[PDB]
């Protein structure tokens, strides 16, 4: 997960690396927290 405004700097990267990785370009925190957290609570809350 990487900022969108860094997508210019994906070009000094070696080529066979770049089809190994998969980049998700973001500009807001809410889409990051949507992408990374599992949708179900497991542990009980701290209260």
């Amino acid at each position: 997960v990487l900022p969108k405004d860094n997508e210019a700097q994906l070009e000094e990267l070696p080529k066979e690396v770049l089809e190994g990785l998969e980049i998700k370009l973001v500009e807001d925190v809410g889409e990051v927290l949507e992408y990374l957290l599992l949708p179900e609570p497991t542990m009980p809350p701290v209260v």
């Binding site: 405004d5 210019a8 700097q9 070009e11 000094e12």
Partner: protein, 74 residues
């Protein structure tokens, strides 16, 4: 740099190079960047010689200088 009217920049390219590759008070960095564009033009002349004059637009500036180094304010 040897070229004589086989290569030519436009003003939009000049403003792009100043805004995106150059952050100083003086003018030294712009001089170095224009030198780099002319020297890459000379290497492209020695690879394949074209005819007449070539006009570098504002789109080809990453093709001649590389990744933009600074970001403008918005």
């Amino acid at each position: 740099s040897g070229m004589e009217g086989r290569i030519e920049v436009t003003d939009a390219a000049i403003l792009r190079v100043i805004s995106e590759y150059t952050r100083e008070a003086g003018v030294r960095g712009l001089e170095r960047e224009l030198g780099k564009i002319a020297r890459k033009g000379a290497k492209f002349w020695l690879e394949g010689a074209w005819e007449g004059l070539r006009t570098i637009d504002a789109s080809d500036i990453p093709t001649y200088l590389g990744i933009p180094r600074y970001r403008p304010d918005k």
